[PDB]
């Protein structure tokens, strides 16, 4: 409603770096808000794509940003009559960033790993990795829970059970208020998908450079499954957290499995022990139901509500014809211990191939009416097909069926404007929450400031 679409702020990065593929707000020790941006194709030392992370300070005019430096050299450790290897080429560092406290977590979902023992090997596979940083202090740390030292032959004998060689940890990420990092790994357990949790404080205190393989006793990974319903479901394609069991001491995880049950797609709510509390099934096959999940209380009843995006949903139209537009589902949490019923509201896209639902960002209370609001991206929507972000306002009955505001893309075609979003943070300190939008196709980030309501 009251986002300023006239005077935007534009940050930018190297060409072809996909700057803006991921972003999040970041407050230092003094509360000074910044913007961390990921560029998963930034050039490395050997003029080869390795990705990178930038930490943009707030400036109403925007501009260029400084790099948040990480180690981009391949590592090797000969130990235990084995040879450990890390390959950061094409790793995609910055394919997902998230901030908590004064710490930044940037992940490289396709960092490869291989263990050599004489003539055998564990196979070179993308286990993924996440780089953690405390910008003010300069501290650095890493977390790669899916690394292993088991050889290829062993997996074959065991029928490829508990195979964490293709996790791609960091594909999605979130951090609980308590400080527990949760990494989605849609390739874990032979493309079933796993989660991996671990306290940030324990990641830092247990990391030392060069070790490559170290223990984080307090971590907690999810479990394999012999169920064909979970096969090739990419469990962990998208992750979030919230409160869905009433007990405020526990933190519940939300996970997206967009190809679950033979591309029917689903999303499950769990506890910190990965025990499924609820499961929400896709409405249509190959709609990628679960591509993006969001948690926020939209009806102002204290209870977090769930929002799920199915970017490729094909709406039914006249003469028995289907049109890919996308869709978003709203699930309101019921009072006390009760299951989440049918979706309270269906938001369907308009622009063909627009992928309405490819991202969903809680905005907080934008118009300050007491109900939290959201922003839905259509990276290829709008009458021009350049991009579009639609703001839906909260209300007692859930959400408004129609958008209060639409943000058309200031970038050219192919910018993927809206592929990433983030809101609910007041960056200019004017009392209203603001929205940042990424456009990795144009290597830029567009900050929308929220102004007092005009009406």
């Amino acid at each position: 409603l009251n986002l300023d679409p006239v005077q935007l702020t534009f940050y930018a990065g190297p060409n072809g770096s996909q700057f803006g593929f991921s972003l999040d707000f970041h407050k230092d020790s003094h509360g000074r808000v910044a913007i961390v941006v990921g560029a998963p194709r930034t050039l490395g030392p050997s003029q080869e794509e390795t990705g990178g992370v930038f930490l943009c300070p707030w400036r109403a005019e925007g501009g260029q940003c400084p790099s948040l430096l990480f180690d981009l050299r391949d590592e090797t450790r000969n130990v235990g009559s084995q040879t450990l290897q890390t390959f950061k080429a094409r790793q995609g560092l910055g394919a997902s960033v998230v901030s908590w406290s004064d710490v930044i977590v940037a992940c490289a979902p396709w960092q490869h790993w291989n263990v050599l023992e004489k003539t055998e090997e564990a196979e070179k596979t993308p286990v993924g990795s996440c780089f953690l940083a405390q910008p003010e202090s300069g501290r650095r740390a890493e977390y790669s829970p899916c690394r292993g030292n088991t050889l290829s032959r062993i997996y074959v004998e065991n029928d490829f059970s508990w195979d964490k060689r293709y996790c791609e940890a960091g594909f999605s990420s979130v951090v609980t208020q308590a400080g527990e990092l949760v990494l989605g790994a849609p390739g874990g357990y032979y493309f079933l998908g796993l989660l991996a949790q671990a306290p940030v404080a324990d990641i830092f205190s247990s990391y030392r450079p060069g070790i490559l393989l170290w223990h984080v006793s307090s971590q907690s990974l999810s479990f394999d499954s012999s169920n064909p319903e979970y096969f090739d479901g990419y469990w962990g394609y998208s992750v979030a957290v919230g409160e869905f069991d009433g007990d405020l001491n526990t933190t519940e995880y939300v996970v997206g499995a967009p190809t679950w049950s033979w591309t029917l797609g689903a999303v499950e709510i769990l506890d910190s022990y990965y025990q499924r509390l609820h499961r929400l099934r896709g409405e249509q096959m190959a709609s990628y139901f679960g591509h993006s999940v969001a948690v926020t209380d939209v009806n102002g009843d204290g209870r977090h509500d769930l929002l799920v995006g199915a970017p490729l949903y094909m709406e039914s139209r006249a003469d028995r014809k289907l049109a890919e537009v996308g869709r978003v589902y709203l699930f309101l949490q019921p009072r006390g211990p009760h299951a989440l019923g049918a979706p309270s509201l269906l938001l369907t896209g308009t622009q063909l191939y627009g992928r309405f639902g490819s991202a969903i960002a809680p905005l907080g209370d934008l118009d300050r009416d007491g109900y939290n609001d959201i922003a839905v991206a259509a990276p290829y929507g709008g009458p021009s097909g350049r991009g579009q972000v639609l703001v839906f306002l909260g209300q007692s009955e859930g959400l408004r069926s129609r958008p209060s505001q639409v943000l058309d893309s200031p970038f050219p075609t192919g910018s993927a404007f809206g592929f990433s979003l983030r809101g609910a943070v007041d960056i200019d300190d004017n009392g209203y929450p603001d929205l940042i939008v990424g456009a990795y196709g144009a290597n830029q980030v567009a900050v929308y400031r929220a102004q007092p309501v005009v009406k």
Partner: antibody
Amino acid sequence: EVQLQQSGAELVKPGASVKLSCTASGFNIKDTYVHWVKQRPEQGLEWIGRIDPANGYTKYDPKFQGKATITADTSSNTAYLQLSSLTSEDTAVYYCVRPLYDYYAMDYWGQGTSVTVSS
Amino acid sequence: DILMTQSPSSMSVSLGDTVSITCHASQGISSNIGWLQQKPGKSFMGLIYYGTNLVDGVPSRFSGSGSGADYSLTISSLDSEDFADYYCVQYAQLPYTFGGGTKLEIKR
């Protein structure tokens, strides 16, 4: 806190078989590798072998192959070391070891089990 | 098997001194070395791992160093408890092999 409660001292006769234990306290035995080390005053320290309690795979020093046999039961949260066809040279103190962070290190040690072989 | 020549076998020193134990390997081990302490009539305690990294709870006066095949443990400002046995252990290759040992004795 990580502590490795090893079994009490053993006193057996030559030619018999003994089985030492190494119960874990404050953590799951299944977390890390578990090594066994033999210590003698003159000879010094000797690495027997290791075991991954999660899967049961093991490695041994070719000096103790046949003599030493390491096992582990995740249920009781304990790891074992069996020594067959004992002799006088098998008179030594035996320690169970696990690493702290590094996968391949030797940081935490039990109190040790004293073994004496004599008729 | 890798041989670990640990020297000296013993040294007589006093409190507050700064001593340095060395450990020589039959081949390169790239910082894959650990240092241990055994107080008299007691079990072992971890001091160092991967060359230079201290084990949690260890005083900062301890410090490892070195590379290739030659490494060294250094204790700055000796304390009364520091008088004990000390061993080095390589885990670059299987089987793991320890050093001869070094006993810190009180001088007089």
